[PDB]
Every structure is written in structure tokens, then in C-alpha cells.
């Protein structure tokens, strides 16, 4: 019986990483 913290731990981490990756997005080819 995982705690609430354990149940939300990895999901929260995946969301944080995905947000960081979107912010990291840069592609100067897009300019054209």
C-alpha cells in the first residue's frame, strides 16, 4: 500500500521533465 507521496512521485517527475524539455525547445530552422 504505497503512500500518497509514492503514488505521485514518478508522475510528478515525468511532468516536471516534460515541462523542462518543452522550455528547452529551440530550433532556428523554424525561423524560416
Amino acid at each position: 500500500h504505497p503512500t500518497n507521496v509514492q503514488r505521485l512521485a514518478e508522475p510528478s517527475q515525468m511532468l516536471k521533465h516534460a515541462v523542462v524539455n518543452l522550455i528547452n525547445y529551440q530550433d532556428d530552422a523554424e525561423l524560416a
Binding site: V5, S12, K16, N21, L22, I23
Partner: protein, 205 residues
């Protein structure tokens, strides 16, 4: 292709909300508060969905990029508030079970005859076992090695002394006129209460 990145934020948001919705629905503690926190994650999550989608469609727009960054900040803030409440809910559940064990220890201590002592002992043993599992799961989440050790020590004292208090109380009931047995019973009871307070304070550190 920037939408590939926006899709991942969406996938992760939905995944997170699914878990949050379940905890908010199943919680016996902070139920209403967890619901409000999840509602906001959902609200900020949908705002992010729109902002991220606009940004992915027009990557070079400093404006759309700005709306996305700010929507991202609001979303992660709501996620943090939910995690905090979820954690408090876990602590509340542990504290309630600790109280069950504390009340059970007093009852074991003061059983009036061997018949009731045996029953109060059978009533306490399962609650101690459950409390320990919960306190152990809390220990693995504690970050300060100090608090982690205090917790470990308190759990050990609790488990080691419950059987001993039974034996001590049994002696008092079998030999009512012997003061030394009552003193021993009180000494063991004291060790147990110190473990209880130890668990209570370590759990909230």
C-alpha cells in the same frame, strides 16, 4: 514537430491528474482540500495545454513562448501544492494509527485481570504491526539522517517493549501485593511512551 513536446506535457499532465484524482477520492484525511488542490492542477493544466499548443505552433513568437513559460510556472506551482497536501495526508494517517497504538498500550498496561490482559494484548499487537509498517514507509522518505535514526530507534523500542509490557502486567496481576512488579510495569510503560513521542515527532520532521 514541436507538438511532439507539447504532447508529452499533455500525456504527463493526464497521468499526474489520474493519480491525483484517485488520492483525492480515496483519502480519509484532507479529502476536501486534496480535491481543491487537484481541481487547480486540472485548471492550470488545461491553461498550459492551450499555451503549449500555441507555442508549439509558433515557436519563434516571444509572446506565445512567454505565455507558455508563465502557464508552466502556474502549473508546477499547483503540482507542488498537491504534493504537499498528499504528504500531509500520509502524516495524518500515521498519527491517527500512532494514537490507536498509544491508547492500546494504556489499555494493555491497565487490564484488570489476566483474562482482559490477554484480550487487550491481542487487541494491541495488530495495531503495533500496522503502525510499524506505516512508520517504516515514512522513515524511508525522511531526508535528515538524524530524524531517520530517531524514527528507526523509536520503532524498535515500540516493537521490543510491547511483549515485555504484557509480561510485566501479567506479573502484577499474578502478584498483586508485590510493589516491585508495578514499578517494573511503569518503567516499561515509560519506555513505550518515549517511543510513541519519538515516532510522533520524527514523523513530522
Amino acid at each position: 514537430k514541436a507538438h511532439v513536446l507539447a504532447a508529452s506535457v499533455e500525456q504527463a499532465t493526464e497521468n499526474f491528474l489520474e493519480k491525483g484524482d484517485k488520492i483525492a477520492k480515496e483519502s480519509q484525511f484532507l479529502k476536501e482540500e486534496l480535491v481543491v488542490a487537484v481541481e487547480d492542477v486540472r485548471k492550470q493544466g488545461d491553461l498550459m495545454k492551450s499555451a503549449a499548443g500555441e507555442f508549439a505552433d509558433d515557436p519563434c513568437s516571444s509572446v506565445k513562448r512567454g505565455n507558455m513559460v508563465r502557464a508552466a510556472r502556474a502549473l508546477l506551482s499547483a503540482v507542488t501544492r498537491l504534493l504537499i497536501l498528499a504528504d500531509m495526508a500520509d502524516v495524518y494517517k500515521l498519527l491517527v494509527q500512532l494514537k490507536v497504538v498509544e491508547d492500546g498500550i494504556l489499555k494493555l498496561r491497565n487490564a484488570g485481570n489476566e483474562q482482559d490482559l490477554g484480550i487487550q494484548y491481542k487487541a494491541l499487537k495488530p495495531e503495533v504491526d500496522k503502525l510499524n509498517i506505516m512508520a517504516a514507509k515514512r522513515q524511508q522518505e525522511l531526508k535528515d539522517v538524524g530524524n531517520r535514526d530517531q524514527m528507526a530507534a523509536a520503532r524498535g523500542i515500540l516493537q521490543k517493549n510491547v511483549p515485555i509490557l504484557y509480561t510485566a502486567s501479567q506479573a502484577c496481576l499474578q502478584h498483586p501485593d508485590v510493589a516491585a512488579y508495578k514499578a517494573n510495569r511503569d518503567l516499561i510503560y515509560k519506555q513505550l511512551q518515549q517511543a510513541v513521542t519519538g515516532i510522533s515527532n520524527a514523523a513530522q520532521a
